[PDB]
Amino acid sequence: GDQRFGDLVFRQLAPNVWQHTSYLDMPGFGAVASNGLIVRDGGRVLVVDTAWTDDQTAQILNWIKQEINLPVALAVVTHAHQDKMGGMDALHAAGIATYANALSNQLAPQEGMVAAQHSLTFAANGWVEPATAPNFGPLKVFYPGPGHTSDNITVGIDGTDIAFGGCLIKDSKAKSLGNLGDADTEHYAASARAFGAAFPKASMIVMSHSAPDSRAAITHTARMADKLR
Ligand SMILES: S=c1[nH]nc(-c2cccnc2)n1C[C@@H]1CCCO1
Ligand SMILES: [Ca+2]
Ligand SMILES: [Ca+2]
Ligand SMILES: [Zn+2]
Ligand SMILES: [Zn+2]
């Protein structure tokens, strides 16, 4: 049921939701998948995360034009690392309004990423301040606290069973929390737990580097993170 367009793979998760997957061949690891989301919101499309590269990101947009044929209104990118923000220039060239955590945009230059056009800010309880996320339709943006990076954010899709943990959440059989080069090992477990509590009825948990899982991914990630303190 999965579809290939250029270097990208797409999988439909729900009537109005698809996962996009892009690959980069890394020293040491070889080919590494990274996943984001595409959401049809009535007459428009919303994107979560770029692909690794601008070329791959343009392939997402072309697949959307071909298969969905609705304007892409905006994209939310989930932290300032290549897998999630590598394709910003491609979104900007296509005229898609981009949104990231303020902190992602502040870190972006140091991390070699291009900042988004707009900054999301968050309350103490993690929820986006709504004036910063105008007309986000079903996307509910949550900052769960520092974990994979200090700026990692997460998104739930209202009206669906789906929530996206990005690179904070690992699958429920994972052996480790993977890339911890920029991680907050002290607060990781609470941040994983906070994402779970923010989206308490999501049953399909989508994440950057494994296929969609159940809520078990959340509790497994938190259990692994507990051992880093
Ligand atoms: S996660 C996360 N954050 N940054 C990156 C990344 C890594 C290497 C180069 N550019 C970005 N990754 C993904 C990989 C996945 C497993 C190893 O790290
Ligand atoms: Ca670029
Ligand atoms: Ca870094
Ligand atoms: Zn990262
Ligand atoms: Zn990642």
Author numbering: 42 to 270
Show me the paper's own sentences about this structure.
BLs are categorised in two distinct families, according to their catalytic mechanism, and further divided into structural classes (Ambler’s classification): class A, C, and D serine β-lactamases (SBLs), which utilize a catalytic serine for β-lactam hydrolysis, and class B metallo-β-lactamases (MBLs), which, in turn, require divalent zinc ions for catalysis. Finally, subclass B1 MBLs inactivate nearly all β-lactam antibiotics, with the sole exception of monobactams. Here, we present the identification of a series of non-covalent scaffolds targeting SBLs and concomitantly MBLs, through a large virtual screening study, in vitro validation, microbiological analysis and X-ray crystallography.
In the binary structures with NDM-1 compound 31 orients similarly to 24, with which it shares the same sulfhydryl-triazole moiety. With respect to 24 in VIM-2, compound 31 in NDM-1 is further stabilized by hydrophobic interactions formed with Ile28/35, Val67/73 and His263/250, and by a hydrogen bond with Gln119/123. The zinc ions maintain the position they have in the apo form, as well as the coordinating residues, i.e. His116/120, His118/122, Asp120/124, His196/189, Cys221/208, His263/250. In particular, in the case of NDM-1 they experience a slight opening upon binding of the inhibitors, while in VIM-2 their position appears quite conserved. It should be noted that the amide sidechain of Gln119/123 is flipped in the X-ray binary complex compared to the structure used for docking simulations, allowing it to interact with the ligand pyridyl nitrogen. We can observe a slight shift towards His196/189, possibly because of the flipped Gln119/123 or, alternatively, for the absence of water molecules in docking simulations.
